[PDB]
Write a protein that binds this ligand. Structure first.
Ligand code: FES
Length: 115
């Protein structure tokens, strides 16, 4: 069954509700639709905001990532029972109407990485 949608709740707090293909990453719809959105991974670029929280409907089918990857989320405060990386898990046939919210971070200690 063809074409899908994604809701994101903004860092500023608005809701924005967009049409997409399957196989797209949440970081790739955030950066492909140019959501006003920054975060803890990759310089806020091609690796990206990382941090989302999902609806308890659409997480419930979903995988979880390594202790190095779920940490990239944990640099936000108060991290939720459905808070997750944009990046492991994409738009698929299971998702027809999915949401995420896009939370705020700033940590007391900070670092950088490059190739
Ligand atoms: S934005 Fe890079 S692993 Fe999530």
């Amino acid at each position: 069954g063809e074409e899908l949608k994604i809701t994101f709740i903004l860092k500023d707090g608005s809701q924005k509700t967009y049409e997409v293909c399957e196989g797209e990453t949440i970081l790739d719809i955030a950066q492909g639709h140019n959501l006003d959105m920054e975060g803890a991974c990759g310089g806020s670029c091609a690796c990206s905001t990382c941090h989302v929280i999902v609806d308890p409907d659409y997480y419930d089918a979903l995988p979880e990532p390594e202790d190095d990857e779920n940490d990239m989320l944990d640099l936000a405060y108060g991290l939720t029972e459905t808070s997750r990386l944009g990046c492991q898990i994409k738009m698929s046939k299971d998702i027809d109407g999915i949401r995420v919210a896009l939370p705020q971070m700033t940590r007391n200690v900070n670092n950088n990485d490059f190739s």
